[PDB]
Amino acid sequence: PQLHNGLDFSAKVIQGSLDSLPQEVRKFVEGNAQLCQPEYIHICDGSEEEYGRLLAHMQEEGVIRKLKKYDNCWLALTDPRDVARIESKTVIITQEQRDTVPIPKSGQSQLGRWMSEEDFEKAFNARFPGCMKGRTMYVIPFSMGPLGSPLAKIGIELTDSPYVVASMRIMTRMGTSVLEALGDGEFIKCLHSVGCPLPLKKPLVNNWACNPELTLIAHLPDRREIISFGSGYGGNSLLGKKCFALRIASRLAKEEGWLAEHMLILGITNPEGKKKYLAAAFPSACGKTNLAMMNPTLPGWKVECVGDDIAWMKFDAQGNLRAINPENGFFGVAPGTSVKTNPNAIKTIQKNTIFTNVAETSDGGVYWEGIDEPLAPGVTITSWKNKEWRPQDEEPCAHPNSRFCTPASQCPIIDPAWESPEGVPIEGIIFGGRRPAGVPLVYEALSWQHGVFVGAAMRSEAKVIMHDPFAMRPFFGYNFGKYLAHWLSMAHRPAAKLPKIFHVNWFRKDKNGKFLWPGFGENSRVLEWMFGRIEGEDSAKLTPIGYVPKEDALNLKGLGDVNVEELFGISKEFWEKEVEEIDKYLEDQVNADLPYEIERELRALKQRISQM
Ligand SMILES: Nc1nc2c(ncn2[C@@H]2O[C@H](COP(=O)(O)OP(=O)(O)O)[C@@H](O)[C@H]2O)c(=O)[nH]1
Ligand SMILES: [Mn+2]
Ligand SMILES: [Mn+2]
Ligand code: NA
Numbered sequence: 001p002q003l004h005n006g007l008d009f010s011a012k013v014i015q016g017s018l019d020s021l022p023q024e025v026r027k028f029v030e031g032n033a034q035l036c037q038p039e040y041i042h043i044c045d046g047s048e049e050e051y052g053r054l055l056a057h058m059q060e061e062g063v064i065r066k067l068k069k070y071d072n073c074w075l076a077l078t079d080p081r082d083v084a085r086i087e088s089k090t091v092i093i094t095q096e097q098r099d100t101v102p103i104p105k106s107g108q109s110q111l112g113r114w115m116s117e118e119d120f121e122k123a124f125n126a127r128f129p130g131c132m133k134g135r136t137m138y139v140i141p142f143s144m145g146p147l148g149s150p151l152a153k154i155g156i157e158l159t160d161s162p163y164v165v166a167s168m169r170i171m172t173r174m175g176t177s178v179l180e181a182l183g184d185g186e187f188i189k190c191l192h193s194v195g196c197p198l199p200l201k202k203p204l205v206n207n208w209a210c211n212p213e214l215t216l217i218a219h220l221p222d223r224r225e226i227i228s229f230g231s232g233y234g235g236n237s238l239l240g241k242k243c244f245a246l247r248i249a250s251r252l253a254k255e256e257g258w259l260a261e262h263m264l265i266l267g268i269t270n271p272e273g274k275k276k277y278l279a280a281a282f283p284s285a286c287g288k289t290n291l292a293m294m295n296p297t298l299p300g301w302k303v304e305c306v307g308d309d310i311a312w313m314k315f316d317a318q319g320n321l322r323a324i325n326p327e328n329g330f331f332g333v334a335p336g337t338s339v340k341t342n343p344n345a346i347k348t349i350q351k352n353t354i355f356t357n358v359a360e361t362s363d364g365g366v367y368w369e370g371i372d373e374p375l376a377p378g379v380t381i382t383s384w385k386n387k388e389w390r391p392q393d394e395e396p397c398a399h400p401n402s403r404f405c406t407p408a409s410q411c412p413i414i415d416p417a418w419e420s421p422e423g424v425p426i427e428g429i430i431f432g433g434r435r436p437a438g439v440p441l442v443y444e445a446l447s448w449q450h451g452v453f454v455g456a457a458m459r460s461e462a463k464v465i466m467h468d469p470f471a472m473r474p475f476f477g478y479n480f481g482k483y484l485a486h487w488l489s490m491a492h493r494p495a496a497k498l499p500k501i502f503h504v505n506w507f508r509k510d511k512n513g514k515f516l517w518p519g520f521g522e523n524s525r526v527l528e529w530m531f532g533r534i535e536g537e538d539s540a541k542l543t544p545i546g547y548v549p550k551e552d553a554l555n556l557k558g559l560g561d562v563n564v565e566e567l568f569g570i571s572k573e574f575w576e577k578e579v580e581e582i583d584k585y586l587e588d589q590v591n592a593d594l595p596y597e598i599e600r601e602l603r604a605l606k607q608r609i610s611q612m
Contacts, residue, residue: 009033009041014136015050016043022182025156028189029139032158036193037130038137044165046141046175054162062207063163064354068364071351075360076163077384078233082210083357084401085235085242087474090217091115092247094478102481102593111473111480111589120218127195127214127229134198135160140190141179142172144240144249144312144326149421151258151312151324153249154182157190157239161209164192164237167354167405170329172240188224188248190239195230206386208232219243221251221477234331234356234403242475245310245326250477254486258314262471264292265307265323265424267415268527271300276531279311279323279499280430281471283460287506287519289332293344293413296524298555303524304415305344306424307408308332313426319495322423327408334358334402338372341520344413345404353406357384359397368398425497427534432504433460433468438574439505441517441567442526444533444540444547448491451501453601454546456484457582461507467585481593488597500534503546508567516567518559525555543570544608575609 009030010018018026058064067073091113092100101112138159145152168174195211215230226243228236235242249260263279282288292308307325316322339346359367362380381397383389389397417424431454445451455470506519529549532539540547548568586594
């Protein structure tokens with residue numbers, strides 16, 4: 001009801017109907033409509049007409065440009081203050097800090113950023129009241145995962161950014177069918193504003209609304225809410241991409257007994273027609289998308305991509321680890337993508353793709369560092385900062401965090417089961433990062449517990465070697481020690497078919513700084529070794545850090561002389577220091593929440609190293 005005319009926003013609805021929404025969805029929409037005071041409410045239906053009209057509207061506003069060399073491709077250039085996720089402004093809200101991060105023994109936690117409820121209420125009241133004035137509030141009903149999959153979760157994102165609506169349509173399953181499937185069910189509440197009510201108080205830069213000084217990306221897992229303010233960029237604004245898929249989801253998985261992980265999922269078939277599925281957790285810029293879309297060099301082998309970033313995994317009644325890719329598209333870093341490194345990505349992004357902060361060629365194409373493709377004479381390049389640019393000029397034409405956002409169904413090697421609601425059965429989990437020294441090309445963990453220890457000890461080159469356990473350091477939705485305990489607890493489920501755990505290093509370097517391994521499609525040779533190991537082949541040699549390939553077990557035919565002894569060299573001196581460094585890290589950062597079994601694997605590794 002009402003004593004006046006201010007609580008019913010039905011008169012401001014320019015698409016859809018508040019009556020057609022489920023009761024809780026309406027209360028979420030109307031309550032924040034009253035707080036944000038949008039001029040209009042647009043309930044997205046997800047149709048191609050709605051999407052084409054939004055795009056053309058953004059084109060006429062100057063928000064995006066059409067890339068004329070390609071079919072329905074678009075380019076957005078942001079405010080340079082709003083170009084990436086900002087970890088320092090990304091927070092999780094819980095009653096007790098220890099539920100979100102382990103209390104470190106001596107240092108500041110690197111494993112999350114907690115904010116008290118009181119502090120967040122102040123931050124929220126200082127940001128959102130009236131923040132959508134003069135703007136449309138879009139209501140985005142979206143499903144994370146195949147609609148109706150037992151692994152899927154549903155979200156509702158409110159945003160004043162049409163760029164977000166267009167990118168969410170690619171990255172999620174979006175629209176009227178989600179509302180119908182949701183019904184009276186539960187959903188994650190997603191609230192996003194770029195924080196620039198009209199009339200504008202501050203200059204608009206490059207037609208890109210943002211509010212960098214008030215940017216704050218908050219997660220409230222006990223209220224099932226994500227609340228993000230001031231940034232329009234990717235991971236801050238597509239609330240499915242990381243906030244939902246990893247931070248909220250990891251908390252939900254802990255409560256409900258599954259896993260939400262920063263993992264590609266791929267399907268690999270060998271020359272005998274056997275197919276296995278693998279998940280791989282690499283930190284950003286360590287090659288998940290290359291591996292997931294690999295063009296294998298080994299004859300007779302095939303790789304197919306289920307996902308390149310997020311896996312949700314649940315042991316089913318039969319004990320198989322079933323995984324879905326909860327996303328609907330790829331949000332890949334553009335620079336470094338070349339036909340040589342990732343030809344299947346190049347094919348993917350030529351249609352129906354939104355690019356952000358890359359360079360544009362005079363004939364309407366895209367350009368970026370590492371594209372490794374010559375331009376015809378006469379063709380010129382506009383930088384991502386909307387200025388003319390020459391190859392020898394001393395600044396990148398594309399921002400290093402620039403993106404393509406492209407439908408997954410367009411990948412030429414997308415796996416035929418990539419949308420199966422049952423998911424795919426994972427037989428192998430791979431960890432890895434950039435290590436210039438000391439870590440062999442590949443080794444296999446001795447046990448599930450050692451494998452969990454291996455993920456926990458992951459490190460990766462930034463001149464700095466940083467800790468990034470499970471590749472999830474920016475993304476843990478809760479206490480990392482309890483996360484380790486959660487992973488370990490999988491071994492105690494009866495019937496559980498624990499996957500083999502591997503660790504790879506594509507990036508070992510010789511004394512001149514040259515990569516010892518050619519990588520890319522040649523990684524199909526490492527995958528081949530893992531495939532055989534999962535089948536039980538006797539291809540492994542035991543070492544202090546785990547199993548490595550026997551001499552001549554790796555297929556190195558068609559390669560030059562790869563320096564195998566240095567690529568697989570294991571130095572007592574390096575590993576003494578490595579285990580020392582892991583010890584200090586886990587004791588400091590996980591402290592009282594470190595599982596016993598992890599402390600034990602650490603002791604065991606130290607002891608194996610001491611005897612070599
Ligand atoms: N040397 C080497 N570099 C790689 C390999 N795979 C990927 N890269 C590089 O790592 C960078 C990031 O790759 P990407 O697939 O975006 O990693 P993601 O950000 O984890 O998906 C790219 O510039 C690649 O060229 C590899 O096997 N060997
Ligand atoms: Mn990627
Ligand atoms: Mn145990
Ligand atoms: Na712009």
